[PDB]
Symmetry: C3
Subunit: 219 residues, 3 copies
């Protein structure tokens, strides 16, 4: 089961890479080329992640369960680019962009510690990582969105759908984590891999398509 969803991730991310790489080469202006290139590297990093996991790399058992710690290494490089998708479309100020990238880097490193620590202590770092995620939720839902609507007042719903889809998908990750083997262990290890794979595909390929649709709406 797990090996199948890892290979589904490889091909989906790799095929996602080809499309965005083709769009970056044939982009009619620089604004389209940057967004195409951003989503291209996002899918390229994710393809390398799933190829590594599919080949049995980047996994050392913690607490008797298979733990793909390599996710946090590639998420660390791919998730800031997904935030750059948002800040580039909204023409967000660099200070807010830096707070988003810093909170995201903090969320991931502390989420890594929760994954590879003993079962009782793990929940402290989970709470820490969730608190850092709550900062991102606030930053994206309030100051980022209002700034973006104020610059593009004829396309407020475009940014609203963008932030909603982005935050619904990101919110699903700590839900899978807390219920998977490294949390309360309510379901299997194979279902956790499938969840993250479905989520990764949506938040990178699916969201990448949405970002292009948003840029066209911005005209």
């Amino acid at each position: 089961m797990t090996q199948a969803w890892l290979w589904i991730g490889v091909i989906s991310m790799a095929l996602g890479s080809v499309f965005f790489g083709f769009g970056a080469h044939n982009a009619k202006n620089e604004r389209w080329q940057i967004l195409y290139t951003l989503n291209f590297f996002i899918c390229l990093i994710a393809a390398g992640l799933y190829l590594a996991m599919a080949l049995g790399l980047g996994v050392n058992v913690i607490a008797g369960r298979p733990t793909y710690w390599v996710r946090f290494v590639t998420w660390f490089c791919s998730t800031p680019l997904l935030l750059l998708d948002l800040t580039f479309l909204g023409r967000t100020s660099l200070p807010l962009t830096g707070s988003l990238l810093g909170a995201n880097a903090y969320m991931l490193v502390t989420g890594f510690v929760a994954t590879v620590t003993a079962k009782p202590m793990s929940y402290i770092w989970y709470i820490v990582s969730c608190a850092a995620y709550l900062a991102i939720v606030y930053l994206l839902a309030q100051p980022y969105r209002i700034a973006a609507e104020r610059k593009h007042p004829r396309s407020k719903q475009a940014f609203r759908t963008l932030v909603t889809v982005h935050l619904v998908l990101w919110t699903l990750y700590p839900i899978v984590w807390i219920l998977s083997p490294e949390g309360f262990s309510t379901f299997t290890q194979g279902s956790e891999t499938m969840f993250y794979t479905l989520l990764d595909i949506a938040s990178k390929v699916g969201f990448g398509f949405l970002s292009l649709n948003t840029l066209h709406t911005l005209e």
Copy 2:
């Protein structure tokens, strides 16, 4: 003894995080918000460090002594932000900012190698790391300070006190290192932890308060 000073670091850095996080939310202009946000992440990274050390993480014995190698991982992210405190207040040119961040990154990585190497060879990397620190001392005491005084000629002592306090505190770190177990081993491992904890608190919380006082003097 050591577990106590680790927990002193957790609470002090965490309480330091709350204050700077509150000041960033209620900042009256963007210049105050950036400085508050900078010191907020500085204390947030340091809180995570001490929480990790307090919980027995990020430490593998080298040469028979307890070695918290996790310090170098978090210093690598927190110390460049402390340099950004200086360059932001002085409106330092980006090339000088890059040399400061590069010399600082070099000092820390080579200082890491000295910490986790055999006893004789360790002193080569210590000398290397100290040489990289001497570059920072020169960069901050001469070109940074003169550039800052030239832009703020009515507040030259503000930058002078700022650089002096910053460099006195940073200079104390290699002194503790060379006399601690990983150096000539003149005192215990508990006193080393207390030294770094006192120093970390001063150079992050204490220096963070000083940076705000300096910005007010700049008006």
Copy 3:
């Protein structure tokens, strides 16, 4: 044999560091200081690499062969600076600079995986890493070079020689890799070290001299 070429690398890179560090201190304008400082850190990172390897650090046997994995750690910081040499001389746009640094970071991480993986699977990551290198070759030979010639139309051969020398040297690295023990293992481990050392010296010290010669031609 190998210990000799490691020490040749230490002294050559260190002596290379002194020269570029002296040129950065006595630079007559800021454009010369930036280029001198860039090549200074390039040789400083490389000196630390060879000092680490000469001292028996950063090497864990993979597949029965001595594998200096520390190369990829220092290449990761030194090779983007060598690309910054090119983009700074050409006044390259930041988006193209970002694609070059991203493709380079991707080439190195996947090349690292090929080095530390089982013998059959290694060639997949080698092909991946070579594909990322081919992107760099295209980026440097077409959009970077044409943009640079268009801004400096009286010095087109300067950039042409620069890109040619840079790409000839970088191309020699995957050739050494595929024929060394971690590839088809046609020659020894000592010859691999000598190859990389000769190549590193050329692409950092030798190329550093070339970059200064190019800047003078640009006047």
